[model samples]
Target chain A: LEVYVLRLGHRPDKRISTHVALTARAFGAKGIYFDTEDKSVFESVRDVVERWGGDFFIKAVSWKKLLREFDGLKVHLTMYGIPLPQKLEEIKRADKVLVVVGPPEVYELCDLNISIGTQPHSEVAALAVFLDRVLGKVFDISFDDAKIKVIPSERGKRVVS
Target chain B: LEVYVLRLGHRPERDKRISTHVALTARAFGAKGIYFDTEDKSVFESVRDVVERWGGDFFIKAVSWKKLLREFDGLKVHLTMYGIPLPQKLEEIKRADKVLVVVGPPEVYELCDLNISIGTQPHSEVAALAVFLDRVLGKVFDISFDDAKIKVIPSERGKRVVS
Candidate 1:
């Protein structure tokens, strides 16, 4: 499954990109988008994806151009849009999916603006949920790159990894 | 509704916090409380501490996940790529009086009563739980910040919040 985003917020620190990158990769993103000036965020995320052996990518693209150029369903995740689940299930069947982490400002560019809920929660939470629903199957594939894999003790963690 | 994280391992500081994202997301979305397995007390507590400080009355307690599963009075939703689609079942899920969601480390997850398939397969446990809870709660307006140090300004474009 391929997924794209437009992340416009930042502390640009390790924690910021760390959460985004980890969640992006974990939720089966093909690439995460950012402004050209956001190199620190890219560097922080790139380092982790490298260690995890995930093939995901971080791309620097202008927001306007990305909105103009993106070919698939343009989905903007935000609190103002329609409720998800049913909406998300409908969106997932398309040939390609482009998810925008918009609803940041007057970011009204996408063909569709959707929401996990209309609540005021973190965009990070919104992204994770949207991607998980769309990329749920992506979670099944195992990346065995790390030498130590967790079997998660069959016995109790107390009585049994 | 309530959630549980049977976190039984600690890979590293960041990694441990990553799993806690499940509980944090639930707390932020307004789950009643979070129940974590007894293993990574440090990880669960630290996760709990974040909620206690930043969010509302959500509490984190250690519990026997295996026992809790059998005894929970409401429905059970387990997130896994292997399970059936939850979107189709969300109506029934909504009608149920209560639901207990298990976002455990692994093996323990298979034993839960029902599985929630958001889509197909492998995604982060944190993301799985986060999305599931959001769908369940769907932006509850009850979430308020009178007790929070940082409060969100109503409808300003950038979501200006004051510390």
Candidate 2:
């Protein structure tokens, strides 16, 4: 299934929003749409994509319009939602998926509301775990055209230019 | 295994929020506590409050990173992109009685027993710790503290909690 992410309620001058975008990209989402635009956050994400070599994109859009018109399942992640384990299979069956990370006027807008765990934690963590499961663990994802690549090592930094 | 986190490169001026997330992610995903090289009092206080309200003994303290790394008797695993992929060493790591997962570094690479990569991609340290603990411990969904002041009741649409 092709998965996309919609980040709602991003505040200005916050690094968490940047984390949200990076997490989405690293975890295998094709792209992300933000309800609010923060150039600093957007630029940070774009920079990573450039060096790391991913086609993943970040764009600002009308949240309400995207939510209503997205041609697939709309899943909103929240602390007060059904546990992800319970909905994993049903979600995997979808042809396309849109995962919304922030909690806002989401209950009625989405098809399913899922929780990574019914506890307080970072939305970055929630997004990571959700993608790890639904995307079948994009853990070892790599980009062929990356400018800089990390050569995994037992110790110390090893990189190729 | 009783796991702990060592957060390095936390700047008092800029990293307060991200470091705080690092600590809470460690706790929620089953880390015992976190040690920082420097203290951001506001960050420490916020973590302590979460422990008090959410009911856990998780702690955040400032200490000498080098001393703790050298002396701590456990598998000292460093989380970095330039390390062995975790799945390769997951079984051996799970066998340890205690685990000290350090999040950032330089000299740390030589000191740690294993340098592990959650993924080769650049992601948040908070995401890294959460994934590591989720795999090694597998406790996020089932973990609960009985003495919590309030507990979440998983639901479909609204916030549900009990005091």
Candidate 3:
């Protein structure tokens, strides 16, 4: 399965968008698309991908075109939607998926509107949990190409360049 | 286990919003409250309003980090990328009655009882905290606040709320 994310309404001054992109990558997404152009956010993600060793991408795209033309399931994550467990089977079956995370037509445009929980929370958390479920624990995934790699330890930080 | 979070070195202007997200994610994921080394009133007030409207007693306060970590009466787990994976220590952490989970920086290694990483990859602290709470407590879905003025009614499409 191929999974990508589309992030809407990113602000230049806020770190939330950058957090969303990084969360998406760490949680096992192949890439992320943003509607707005924020060079700093884009560069930060690129820098991570460069050093951390993954093909995960961050790019600018048209939300409308991507939502309309995308060839697989489109799931919009919102607090108002159905619980994710309810839609897990269908989502897991899809060969290509586009997950939308934002701060709307969004309702009618997507194939599913899922919620991590009914309560209000951060998109970073929302995206993290969503990807964790769909990808089956991607937090432990790593790129073989990483320039800097972390060796997990019990008491302290350990890494090798 | 009773879990609380300590956020260190939060910048008033740069970290105001992200810090607030950390506080809320903690509450939503079953943490009782959060403590910060520095307080931004804007961040604190926003968190208080959510607790008020959402029906929980979740709180955010500024305190002395060094003292709190040293004097705290329970297990202290620090979330960091350089630490061990969470699953390895999940059961041991679960065995505690009270937990102080910390997010952000040094001298911390010696202060806490454990240093855990949700994943070795670099990601948001919000993600780490949410996963930790979800796995250890698994409380986000069924947990609710008794005094909440509004609640989400999960639906297939669009939002549903009843006050």
Candidate 4:
């Protein structure tokens, strides 16, 4: 089966509407995989769709999908606490993932799958570099800001079908 | 077989007690004819004695006895609202030797061999009179107090006895 994912940002103004629009779009496209660290965001999006007369199914994808994804993989890990094998797998395989890092544990856990570190220069610049590399997308990309790099995977193409 | 007519009187403190004492004294002396009238006597003394203490046999003299003894010939004519001759004859003859009034209309009807009438008075007086008569005679009597009188005859010797 094919799994699609959408990411939502926590901008309170259009957050609910945008998430609803994205969910509708994803459903129209038959998107199945969804992950959001913000529970409120997840509930609001779910509520909007339900209120608009949409039928959908939700399951705890973190533990199950993660377990299935990392059934045989081994990798380095660092987190606020010990990372379960299944969680590590989700970080590795999440297609369009949103990580709301409010605490050290969030980053520490994320570091298990995607490399995360801090520098002394600028917190925002350092974070922007880390997100850009981890997400494989450019955010506020300018030559003046300090840069952080995330090495691309050497393992064979992990394309989800 | 001898038939005797006996009369006695008492003025007691209570009418009922006088009636009772008279009935008792009459019964003791083998009185065969008696007449007692006490309006205030509510209790039947002989009846009470039979029922309560002595448990003896007694009689309730009928109005027919009075009528036969006082007015009618030895023959009785019964007038009934409904007529049945056989049952009346049977009832009349049940105590064959004792004189009874067979009034009303019916089959096998016979005027009693001795017919009598009692004056139509209140039930209490009539009842006391009947008891007094029954006890004195030492014989059972039956009477209905509906406009009747008694016819008395000279005492007959053999008729009072049962063979």
RMSD each, Å:
7.7, 1.2, 1.3, 59.0
- Candidate 2: which stretches are off by over 4 Å? none
Candidate 2 residue-wise lDDT, B1-163, digit = tens: 9999999999988998889889988888888999998988999999999998989899899999999999999999998878898999999999999999998646788899999998888888888888899999999888888889989898777778998
Give the higher-TM-score candidate: 1 or 2: 2
- Chain A TM-score of model 1 versus the true structure? 0.80
At residue B109, what lDDT does model 2 achieve? Answer: 81
* Docking class of predicted structure 2: medium
Interface RMSD of 2: 1.1
Candidate 1 lDDT over B11-112, as tens digits, reads 554555455565566666667776766546675676656655555677677677778776778877776555655666677777776777766455555566
TM-score for model 2?
Answer: 0.97
Candidate achieving the largest lDDT: 2
Q: What is the interface RMSD of each candidate, in Å?
A: 7.1, 1.1, 1.2, 67.5
The TM-score values for the models, in the order shown, are: 0.58, 0.97, 0.97, 0.18
CA lDDT, candidate 3, residue B99: 98
C-alpha positional error of residue B13 in candidate 1 after TM-score superposition, expressed in Å: 5.6
Clashing pairs in 1: A136-B121, A137-B120, A137-B121, A138-B122, A139-B121, A139-B122, A139-B123, A140-B121, A140-B122, A156-A160
For every prediction, compared with the true complex, DockQ reads 0.15, 0.78, 0.75, 0.00
- For model 2, what is the error of residue A140's alpha carbon versus the real structure, in angstroms, after optimal superposition? 2.6
Deviating ranges (above 4 Å) for candidate 1: A1-3, A7-30, A34-124, A129-161, B1-14, B39-48, B105-110, B140-142, B154-159
Assess candidate 4 and give its TM-score to the true structure.
0.18
Q: Write the per-residue lDDT of candidate 4 for residues B3-55, one digit (tens) a residue.
A: 22212223445344434433443333233333432222344544443333322
Question: Can you tell me which runs of candidate 4 are displaced by over 4 Å?
Answer: A1-161, B2-16, B31-41, B60-68, B71-163
